């Protein structure tokens, strides 16, 4: 259900998410399963939701967070780091800070998002080294 869920979250529709929790409960499938995660970079539902949104109000974040809470895997899900080389270590908090939305930052911090996570991807490295942007590899520094 990775493609359908990705499309639903990208479109921002909230009704389509109905029935996901019963499916997870019946199949006992966690939201961090390899199948759900994008193979290319280990990207998960939450960073995809935060990347694309309308006026900073994607409106799908709280529902997904509640679902993760019900599954009992909120801590792992919120701060799931990206794999690969270019965007290694990036988390949801960095994206929320970058998009200049205070509300999602407050939500992630309150729900238990890690605040000392380090982003060490090559894209985040200094200019002369190969990374187009460098900010100290920290949320507060960013």
């Amino acid at each position: 259900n990775r493609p359908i869920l990705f499309d639903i979250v990208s479109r921002g529709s909230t009704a389509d998410l109905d029935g996901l929790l019963p499916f997870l409960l019946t199949h006992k499938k966690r939201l961090t399963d390899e199948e759900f995660r994008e193979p290319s970079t280990g990207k998960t539902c939450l960073p995809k939701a935060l990347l694309n949104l309308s006026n900073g109000r994607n409106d799908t974040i709280p529902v997904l967070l509640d679902i993760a809470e019900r599954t009992g895997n909120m801590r792992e899900f919120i701060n799931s780091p990206f794999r690969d080389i270019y965007y290694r270590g990036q988390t949801a908090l960095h994206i929320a800070i970058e998009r200049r939305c205070k509300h999602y930052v407050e939500l992630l911090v309150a729900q238990g998002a890690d605040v000392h996570a380090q982003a060490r991807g090559r894209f985040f490295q200094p200019k002369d080294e190969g990374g187009y942007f460098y900010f100290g590899e920290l949320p507060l520094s960013l």
Partner: protein
């Protein structure tokens, strides 16, 4: 003052209790019903000698489809826990043949700490009786003492997740190994 973040990765053969070891470190409560295949994305606070360290604990598995993604967890590792079982002798001879060269291939010049699990199980009678069916005996601690020397392990220890014996000291040794700055560079090019 400011806690220092260090990366610890635990690697061992299946059913060795690596996940149980890290879980007992995490919540000091043995899960007797449900054990996740991997315990990921956890940072624990530890103080050893006037220093505060946040240890990021990573686990590696190969039960299903985890071998392909295992290499991704090695880079930027600060300390390795080479983990095996005292109740399963087969967990020993496989350490040098296949695990060690991979460790040196991906992340060289990294401190490695040997650890054997299930200290009590070595003295059990049912385990000994079942194991004798194949002409095998529990792992001898002295054999581990020497095996640590052969593979150049920083230190080798024993842990028992059931009775929470030596977990604190073992991971403290891991951390003290991590804080070590290593020795410059060897045979560095001109």
């Amino acid at each position: 003052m400011a806690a220092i973040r260090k990366k610890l990765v635990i690697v061992g053969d299946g059913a060795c209790g690596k996940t149980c070891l890290l879980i007992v470190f995490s919540k000091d409560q043995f899960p007797e019903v449900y054990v996740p295949t991997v315990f990921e994305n956890y940072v624990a606070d530890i103080e050893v000698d006037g220093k505060q360290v946040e240890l990021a604990l990573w686990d590696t598995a190969g039960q299903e489809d985890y071998d392909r993604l295992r290499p991704l967890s090695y880079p930027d590792t600060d300390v390795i826990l080479m983990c095996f079982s005292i109740d399963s002798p087969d967990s020993l001879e496989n350490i040098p043949e296949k695990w060690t060269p991979e460790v040196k291939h991906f992340c060289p010049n990294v401190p490695i700490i040997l650890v054997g699990n299930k200290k009590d199980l070595r003295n059990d009678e049912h385990t000994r009786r079942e194991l004798a069916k194949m002409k095998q005996e529990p792992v001898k601690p002295e054999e581990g003492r020497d095996m640590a020397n052969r593979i150049g392990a920083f230190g080798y220890m024993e842990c028992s997740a059931k009775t929470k014996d030596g977990v604190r000291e073992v991971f403290e040794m891991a951390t003290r190994a991590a804080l070590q700055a290593r020795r410059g560079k060897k045979k560095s090019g001109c």
